[PDB]
Structure formats: C-alpha cells, structure tokens
C-alpha cells in the first residue's frame, strides 16, 4: 500500500468535521 489507508479515511472525516465546525461558528455569528 503506497499510503496507509487509515490516513486517507482520517483525512476525509477530519476535513468534513473542520468544515462543519467553521460553518456552525459562522452560522452562530450570523444568527446574533
């Protein structure tokens, strides 16, 4: 395996969660 498969799953999950995190903060900053 050229790249450890967990890292490319971890990456997708972490990317989606940080995108969620910034969306929710801006949503809360725009609902006040």
């Amino acid at each position: 395996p050229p790249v450890s498969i967990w890292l490319i799953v971890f990456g997708v999950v972490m990317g989606v969660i940080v995108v969620g995190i910034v969306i929710l903060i801006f949503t809360g900053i725009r609902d006040r």
Partner: protein, 597 residues
Amino acid sequence: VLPNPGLDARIPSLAELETIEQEEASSRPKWDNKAQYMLTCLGFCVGLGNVWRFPYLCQSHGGGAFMIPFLILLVLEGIPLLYLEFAIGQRLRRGSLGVWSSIHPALKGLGLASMLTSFMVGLYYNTIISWIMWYLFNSFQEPLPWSDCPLNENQTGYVDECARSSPVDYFWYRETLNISTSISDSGSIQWWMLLCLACAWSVLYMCTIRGIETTGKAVYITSTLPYVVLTIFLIRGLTLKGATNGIVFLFTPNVTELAQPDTWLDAGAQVFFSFSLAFGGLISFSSYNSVHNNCEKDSVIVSIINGFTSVYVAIVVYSVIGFRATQRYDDCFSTNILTLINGFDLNVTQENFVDMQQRCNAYAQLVFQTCDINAFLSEAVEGTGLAFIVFTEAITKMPLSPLWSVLFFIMLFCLGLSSMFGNMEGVVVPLQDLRVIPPKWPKEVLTGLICLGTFLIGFIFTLNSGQYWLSLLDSYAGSIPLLIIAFCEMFSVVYVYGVDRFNKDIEFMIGHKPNIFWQVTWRVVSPLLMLIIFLFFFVVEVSQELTYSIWDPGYEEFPKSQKISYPNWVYVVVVIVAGVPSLTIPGYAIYKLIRNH
C-alpha cells in the same frame, strides 16, 4: 425535616413556576420536541456505560450470576434516584449546581463533585471513543489489518509476539497501543493515537457547539442507529456457530457467585453508571421540559428500556463468546486428531478419536491438548479485550469482514458520542453557573476551552503506558465518588428540601402525589442500600492491593497475562481521583459554615 430556614425566595414558587415557564422562552434553552428529550435520555442512560461496562461485568464474576443483583438494584435503588433527578430538575428549573445550592447554600459542593465526576468520566469515555475510531478508520480494507502479522527476516515466520500471541493481540497491543512493560515505564506520545483523540474531541465539539440547540439535532442519528445495528449483531450473533452454547452458559449461573460480597458491590456502582446518575446532566436535561411533563412515566420508560437493553447486549456478547469458544474447542480437537493421525499414520473424527486413540495405545511422545469448551467459555478477557480481541477476531471470520467491522465501530462510536453529550452537558452548565468566564463571550467559546482542556489532559492516555493509566479509572477510584453523590442527592431532596414539599410539587406537575412504592424507597429502602453498598465498597474493594495486567513479550508464559501490584506512588493518583470529588461535598459545606459565622 432538618432545620432549613427561608427555603422560599431561593427557589421559584409553583405560581411563578406556571408563569416563568413563558419567562424561560429565551432566558433558557428548551427542548423543541419531547421526542428530542426522550432520545437524549435514551443515549445518556443507554449509551457507553450501559452497553460497554455491563458485558465486561457479566463476562467477569458469573454470566447470569451478576445479572440478578443488577436488576434487583436497578429498581430498588436506580428507578427511585432517576425519578428524583428528573422531578427536581423539572421543579427548580435549574441545572445540577443550581438545584443543590437552592435546596441549601452549603450543598454547593454537591454540584462541584458532580461537575468533576462528569469531567473525569468524559475524559475516560473520550479515550474509548478514540480507540473505537482508530479501529473504525482501519476497517475499510478487504483483509482487515488485524487478520495477519508482519513477516520476519526469514519471511517464514511472523513477529515473535504475533507468533506466540494472536494477530488481533499484536494489532491491539503493538500496532495500536505500542504498550510498554509497566505503568512506571512511560514512553513518548504515539502520534496516531493523539491524531484519533483529536478527531474524537473535534467531532464532539462540532455536535455540542451551541448547547442543546445542536445536540438535539444530533441525537436523531446518534440514539437510533446504535439500536438498529445492535439488533443486526443479535441476528448475526445468534446465527453464528456454537453461539447457542454461549447463551446457555450465560443463563446457567453458579449461585455461589451471587453469595460473594464483591458481586453486589460491582452491581450497585454499575447501576449509577448504567443510568448516568450523579453526573448531573439528567437534572439539567429535565429542567428544559414543560413544568406539566409526566416525569414518573419518563423515569419508568427509561428504566425499563435501560434494564431490557442490558440483557439484550449480554445476549449479543455471549453469542460471540460461545462462537469463539466453539471455534477454539474445534481447533484443539482437530489439532489433537492431527497429532495422533500423523504419529500413528491414521478416521479420527469426533467419536472415532476417543475410541481410536485407545486403539493407538508414539502415544507418550505424542503431546495432546485438553479440549473442554466449558473451559473455553469460562476464560475471562483482559479489560477492553471483548471489543478489540474477541469481537474483532470473530468478525474476521464473517463473510464480508469489512462491512461488519465498520458497522460494529459505527455503533460503538454513535452510542459513545451520545453518552458524551450528557457528560459535556454536566461540565458546561455548572461552569456557566459559576459565572467563571465573562458573560459577553458566546456559549461556543466556553465549550471549545473545555474540549481543548480535556483534549490536553488526555495526552497521558496516548503514552506507551496510557492503557495502564486508563485501567486505573476502572478501579474503585472511579466509583467511590458516584456512591457518595447519589446518597447525598437522595438525602438532600428527602431530609433537607423535605419529601412532603417534594411530594406536593410532584402533585402540582404530573397531577397525582407519588405512590407508596416511591415513598418506601426514597424514605428508607433506597438510602439504606447506598449506605450498605459504599460501606461494603470501603471494606472489600478499597481494602485490597491494586494490581493490573501487563503485556510483556519477554515473560514466562508470555501469552498468559501477568498480574503485578501497582508502584506505591499510584496510590497518590487514586487517593486524589477518589477524594477530590468525594471530600468536595463535606469540604465546601465546612467552608460555608466558617465564613457565615
């Protein structure tokens, strides 16, 4: 009954209670739907803690032996305290720290012990979540990474550990933990464990960004999916070979286990972890309901579901235990049949083996293993091994290994995340009600500071010795405070706030005044059980040398776990984790009775 002065003008009146309900429209968070409240309670009382510790307690002690005491105390001790936590939250319209100070200003230590306890149990759970999601990240490869070993220099053999131990043992202890020899030996932080821990805390912050106006939307996928996957693991488990040999093993208990002090002491502690009682989350969650919500119906429904799920989970864990045991027994036999088939150059199947072996009588030279099946069933698993060495190895035998593995970890991740919602509720709210951060800052700022804080504290569980460190919180250390708080919560609402006033308030909300069953438990039965239980804790568990299982490749009978005594300095760590929140209830009271006078 105790001499409480001017309790009113510290608590809301029933008249204001009926009106302030509208005043709390924006002043406080409110459940959008009852569904949304019931799903939260379901996850907090039927998530990790009810579904993780229970099968470990059932596997230890005796199978069915441990289940009897648990269901006795679930109703004789747990239902009362769950109904008392729900009603008092719904009446005083405030979180844990608010509900205790209101009853009496010297009981504010009871809401700080609950906050500390909630903090520590979240720190513990989060780690379990991090390991779960390490395993969930590795389960997207046709041949799952724990189904084989790395090759040696000869390529004809696997790593010695992997060779002497199991592939699943080598993936847990070496590839995941890189576990050291002793708690004393502490290596650097294993970067991949730190990375999964970051993922865990990150997902939890995202789901709890903005209190209950974000977790209520989360519990729609987080309190349903775990129960629609655990009924599939029950079908799959029941359809496994030798599975019914393990279910019977669970329902054929030794009565001499039920007559052991240690079984009861573990069941009581377990009641207060099954239902997240004395974490203070439940009080807060019940305080966002309508003032006219039937909390008696809610407590009974939650308890029934929580009781019935405990048995449904031990029937899924024992189907797999008897499946593995059956496989191991078949191997032993097969290997025995091979020893003699090759040695005597000979039809040696099941019945023939016994009769033929007698005829063969190289018998001496031949070495034969002892196959028992009952011994295979009665072989305990190392802490956390049931999920990472027993369930993982059984899935590797399933036809679509990756599908199941993924599903198994997604269920454990979801019912963990669910559990963490309440654990975080019970540390955010007390911290709001201390008014510790400037109230101009938004709720999201305070929730991230505790996420990072507990994240930074969780680096200790990421070292080589981290697993040993985590197994200290599975000692009496993590259980002593729960008993103290639960007892204090019952005593304060009955002999301080007054059971007569409490009963009248219950009558004002639900409509009727609570039955004789509720009266006989709250007044005498429930408090007594707690008294007898924690005293037995102090006389049995505490009065015992603390020992842990170490994984040393360089050890005689290496595959066999080695039990050693902890180094004396870890009593400091236990003394602290137990007292910190247990001496808070006395020691804030004494502070309030020497500042006032």
